[PDB]
């Protein structure tokens, strides 16, 4: 795609290596789901563990994510708006996004 930190078909394994090797929280990227066509995954590092969230297209061209049980599904007009929200602290994600890992 367009976004510099979208990696397309990137294995879960390579994803983990790229996200965790620096040893810092908040490294993140987007990749394709390995199993569900048309689904994206936002993957981010926290305390040496990768946390993965699937992002669905409604489609309607919007992007849907649910970060936790009892958090409402949230829909965004664009991936950039989704990423921008979770760059802020304490927004219901395990960790906030800091450094985009570029392709």
DSSP string over the chain = --STTB-SS--HHHHHHHHHTT--TTEEEEEE-SSSTT-EEEEEEETTEEEEEEEEE-STT-EEE--STTSPPEEESSHHHHHHHHTSSSSSSSS---EE---
Tell me the domain boundaries of the chain: 1-103
Helix (H) or strand (E) holding 44: strand 40-46
Radius of gyration of the chain (CA): 13
Q: Is 12 left (phi over 0), alpha (psi -120 to 50) or beta?
A: alpha
Three-class DSSP category at 23: coil
The technique is X-ray
Three-class DSSP category at 84: helix
Domain 1-103 has CATH 3.30.420.40: no
CA pair distance 75, 9, nearest whole angstrom = 23
- Torsions phi, psi for 98 (to 5 deg): -120, -70
Q: Could you tell me the two tokens for 101?
A: 């890992």
CA pair distance 30, 80, nearest whole angstrom = 11
Q: In the sheet where 99-100 sits, what is the strand order? A: 74-76, 63-65, 49-57, 40-46, 27-32, 99-100
Resolution of this structure in Å: 1.7
CA nearest neighbour of 40 among 95, 87, 78, 97: 78
Residue 37 CA from chain centroid, whole number: 16
């Amino acid at each position: 795609m367009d976004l510099p930190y979208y990696h397309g078909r990137l294995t879960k394994q390579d994803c983990e290596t790229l996200l965790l090797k620096e040893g810092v929280d908040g490294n993140f990227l987007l990749r394709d789901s390995e199993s569900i066509p048309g689904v994206l995954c936002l993957c981010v590092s926290f305390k040496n563990i990768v946390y993965t969230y699937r992002i669905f297209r409604e489609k309607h061209g919007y992007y849907r994510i649910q970060t936790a049980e009892g958090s409402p599904k949230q829909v965004f007009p664009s991936l950039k708006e989704l990423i921008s929200k979770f760059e802020k602290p304490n927004q219901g994600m395990v960790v906030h996004l800091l450094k985009p890992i570029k392709r």
